[PDB]
Write a structure and sequence with these properties.
The structure is a homotetramer of 333-residue chains. By secondary structure, the first copy, chain A, is an alpha/beta fold. Chain A folds into 2 domains: 162 residues, Rossmann fold (3-Layer(aba) Sandwich), CATH 3.40.50.720; 168 residues, Dihydrodipicolinate Reductase, domain 2. Chain A is built from 8 helices and 16 strands. In chain A, 62% of the residues are buried. Chains in contact: A-B, A-C, A-D, B-C, B-D, C-D. The structure holds nicotinamide-adenine-dinucleotide (3 copies) and Dimethyl fumarate (9HB) (3 copies). Chains A, B, C, D: It comes from Mus musculus.
Chain lengths: 333, 333, 333, 333
């Protein structure tokens, strides 16, 4: 495969490493995290409150992190410019620290000998891609790219199927979203976004999300036709998209289901899922889909105005898409 | 003031009793609950995990419950027909067990001498009223009435203001709702509502709600123009309405804020609130409003298609509305 | 392998069924639960908020619950005297409803053709057993037995090792315990035990437990030398034992560690575990041990006065021990 | 009343301010925090997820934080030696950042013109005081003091009563402790305390505490006779001390209750509380006691070996003790 270095060994960094090592679709050869040393990396990778103990062996050997017998070079650079990616043989770097989302900042890795960078977040100026939706618009000239956000990877496949078949005239989305590392256990400082500092385990917290507008970038005909917002709620993982949209062509709810179900069995297999079961959020913990349409939870007001519900494991589904994107890029070289 | 019996000393029964006692609009004179004996009522009224210790005295004396020096007759009847309301002097009865919501069942209280019954829940056939929206359409021939649901009591005053000023062509609603007594601590049997049995503290749980349709009964012009659904999430109190609606007349977001703020200061004062602060759900705990508009959390895609956010303490706001409705009804005797 | 019937398809009944299947030690041939119809059992067995989706197939077919292709007979009787266990071939019945814990009540299963009953909880009069501690005291005259509680199955193996090497003069135990089905989502009625009705998601809740005393029954020499209590805290699963005990023979803390480590690799392997990792409760979710010693978490005041810490998955470890006890009983036949 | 400056507007500094204003025992005249603008201070003081909205008026006016009409000078100094306490009239300074807990660091505030410094945390080298237990050991030569920790303030009053009357031969403590600002919302990096980084809302987490050893300095006769540890649990606030101790003189449990009750009504009034009710943790939210003994939750094994339970609001009880300690110091000047 392509040899991958991971910058930022957090929720996404470690679950991208889990998906890479377990799927075998790419090879992790290096990790950088100045806040997690090699022995700490062993513990943080082995144990996971949300996805359970890693099924396999992980150890420290001669200064390397050894996962299922295979060594991984470890870096401790706060400055992404000083990471010697080339010497470790890492061709692609996953930028998952949360603090290098612009091309200028994410371009640091190229200096170390990396050849392309995949920002595990929206970017102000890097080209953004959602597997199943616009990844074929990638081309080899793009050395710095973004895999958008979890919420965008949930909404864009759904919005693609609804728009392709019935036309979205306009839509508004809410995501009811699990807590993340940027939140606080008790009321604490968060100077730019005051509500995000309030106690994550106590509160429903409204928050902004660019995910709906960003869908207008991965689906250009939806530009200006979608926006939305978010609620953070006290669950540790798994989120859900609630898309209220008005349709061009009339659609009985059973045709929406039928069309969404066909897409989940066809080209969006593994990316867009479909279910009619009485599911709840924990039923999608460690599910690798980008988006699972929840037939029974949605509701139509009429044939042109509907509320559609789609679940996503915001940690693990997104991490698998990071791997899929990199594998697609490597196949295009 | 009217004298009141409370049937069902649960979350709503006890909080109706709080709001009545320390606001002097009505007088609780009797309570029936066959699963809470007198001494247990002292303890359950005294302490509240959500709203804090009762501020006042509560004791058991001569077989009655005495709150701030005022004795309350205590019954232990599983069947409402056997409650001697009249002999206790309860003129109105708050039906807050959750299992007598039809006119046939709630009417059992009139056999014990009660004059009128206020069901603390939507009713399949009893007329439904929301303070500030349609309570003046009540008339004195109605011996059995419903105070709708807490979600209807949050959505309807907002919908009234929006529809009065701009016309709601159509709307879809989501309520992100706190846990209630009908849910389960761990995955367990829940009759035919299978999702409602799943662990309340672990899950985001989609659920059905009539509230948006019931708005079409409370605001006739909106009949068939609103529906919606709910997500139960792990908080113990306080919920929020997310109304996505299409407007007939174009409205800038700042014009929406203007009319809502003005309504909150005029005829809907104390029922509909308005805020521009960076609030989260806990900021409405023990808030007696039916609906507080949250200016900053909402978002407009354009001048005719907007997402509006309104907070509600589903426990204490509704319970004050139950008192207000009975005081209003009493004022028309 | 012995054919087993399950009375009460709850947390324990369902995880005993998972454990039976995952381990092959017994064969579930029938299940009784009047509150969970056949199609509903498919769903409750398949989806699990705590332990994840069932790994295998489960379907309803021709009136039977079919798990991994094996059909299981389904009863729907509230009264155990009416379950036709013998018609289904069930020799042992797991009594896991929580309402038939005496020998009189559990004995109803013998009227239906069951040969033995294993009560999934402490019993007032049925003999109680803890795998690895006193299960060899079981003999074939015992047609009704108790597998004690999960807290006893955690405390007793540890207490046995400690007492056999240094002698426990006296000890007091706290278990910090996850929430269970008997608790309430919000402050509600709990007539017998007032604290157990307070909202489980909000509260540290003191609770009684006879578990440490029950160790005096399974380890006779410790009779009257152990008692304890519990705190119910807001987690969905996994609990921890905190044993403060005085020792007759002096022991350095690393003598304690080494003796427990040896026991966990010898005759108590699979029952008592040992770790020095910086674990937290979620690291034992879905762990089959009765009791895992946490070396780093305990602390000694001196060589004779120590506080020892041991983790237990209260759902899954206990369920595996029920299966283990039935399999041991079968080999004695 | 003494005029007080507050360094750090985190939970402690804010709740100390609430306590000071609500009790009128001292006057806040100045606040320093370089990470929080004045308008953010208004918001953070006004809204509190745990203790509810401030009951009073909070606004910014001419660069000052005006609480109930009284203005308060605001500083934004990185370095405490640069804060100008003197010109603000601040005589005592609460050092509530957590990083200036030594006498050398805390003394910096003396360079700004403050007369005394009260560290709101344990100190390596400043004398630690527990109100009600050893505050008689304060003298006017002490310019820098510590109020110890909230757990120390729970345990020491209870230990004193029990050791004064029966003699603690040796004791082992566990505190079951609510979530704090040092924890993480999801599994994240946590320096050398690996367990503290695991998801706070999901886990029961073992932790260290110096509180038991500190009580052996607050009460010198107990030096080397107490040690302990903590479990971090998923609640927002309120903790509980679990003290298992051996008594020199034998005591019936009703003897223990009687002397504790007697101390709570006498010299430890308002510091040590006493209850026999079926309390749970939320019943002590915003309670100003250091320690409330829970008669029904404890258990005696015999007359020389007991487990004693005492509740503390780890946020608000401690904050009120900071104010009382300052008022006590001011009365000795
Ligand atoms: N639901 C999700 O969790 C999710 C989904 C998609 C995208 N993202 C995005 O992924 C990015 C990281 O998310 P996360 O959830 O994994 O957060 P995280 O905090 O758990 O992990 C970020 C990691 O980066 C490390 N780090 C910090 N600074 C670093 C630096 N200079 N150099 C190297 N490592 C550094 C940190 O120690 C940490 O381990 C963010 O942009 C996030 O918005 C999160
Ligand atoms: N946020 C809310 O909780 C909320 C808000 C508005 C309306 N409601 C509705 O109010 C009703 C009660 O809800 P709740 O939250 O207070 O639930 P709850 O379980 O806390 O209270 C129900 C009470 O009814 C008692 N009871 C049961 N059967 C009885 C009988 N035959 N006779 C007398 N008493 C009996 C029960 O002991 C219990 O105390 C429901 O219909 C509910 O949907 C709830
Ligand atoms: N951590 C644990 O949950 C745990 C551990 C060890 C032991 N136990 C004990 O096991 C027993 C059950 O515990 P649980 O957590 O599984 O409770 P649960 O509520 O999850 O399951 C109880 C099941 O019994 C069913 N039931 C009720 N009445 C019945 C009847 N007449 N006939 C047949 N079925 C009936 C119920 O529908 C329910 O599904 C209790 O005694 C408990 O204390 C529980
Ligand atoms: C990063 O993962 C997410 O959940 C996306 C939310 C968001 O960033 O809105 C665009
Ligand atoms: C009682 O208040 C609510 O729970 C609102 C939900 C509802 O009942 O739907 C109409
Ligand atoms: C399974 O539940 C428990 O562990 C505690 C119950 C108890 O009292 O112990 C005998």
């Amino acid at each position: 495969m392509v040899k991958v270095g991971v910058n930022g060994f957090g929720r996404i960094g470690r679950l991208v490493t889990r998906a890479a090592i377990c799927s075998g679709k790419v090879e992790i050869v290096a990790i950088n995290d100045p806040f997690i040393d090699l022995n700490y990396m062993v513990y943080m990778f082995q144990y996971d409150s949300t996805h359970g103990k890693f099924n396999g062996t992980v150890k420290a050997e001669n200064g390397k992190l050894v996962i299922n017998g295979k060594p991984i070079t470890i870096f401790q650079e706060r400055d992404p410019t000083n990471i010697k990616w080339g010497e470790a043989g890492a061709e692609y770097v996953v930028e998952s620290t949360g603090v290098f989302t612009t091309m200028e900042k994410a371009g640091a890795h190229l200096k170390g000998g990396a050849k392309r960078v995949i920002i595990s977040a929206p970017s102000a100026d890097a080209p953004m891609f959602v597997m199943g939706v616009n990844h074929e618009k990638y081309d080899n000239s793009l050395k710095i790219v973004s895999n958008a956000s979890s919420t965008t990877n949930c909404l864009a496949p759904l919005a693609k199927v609804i728009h392709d078949n019935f036309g979205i005239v306009e839509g508004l989305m809410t995501t009811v979203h699990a807590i993340t590392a940027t939140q606080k256990t008790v009321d604490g400082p968060s100077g730019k976004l005051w509500r995000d500092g309030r106690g994550a385990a106590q509160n429903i917290i409204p928050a902004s999300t660019g995910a709906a507008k960003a869908v207008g970038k991965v689906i250009p005909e939806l530009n200006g036709k979608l926006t939305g917002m978010a609620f953070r709620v006290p669950t540790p993982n798994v989120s859900v998209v609630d898309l209220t949209c008005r349709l061009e062509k009339p659609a009985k709810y059973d045709d929406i289901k039928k069309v969404v179900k066909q897409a989940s069995e066809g080209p969006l297999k593994g990316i867009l899922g479909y279910t009619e079961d009485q599911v709840v959020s924990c039923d999608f913990n460690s599910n690798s889909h980008s988006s699972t349409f929840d037939a029974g939870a949605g509701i139509a007001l009429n044939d042109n105005f509907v509320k559609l519900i789609s679940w996503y494991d915001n940690e693990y589904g997104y991490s698998n898409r990071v791997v899929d994107l990199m594998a697609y890029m490597a196949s295009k070289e």
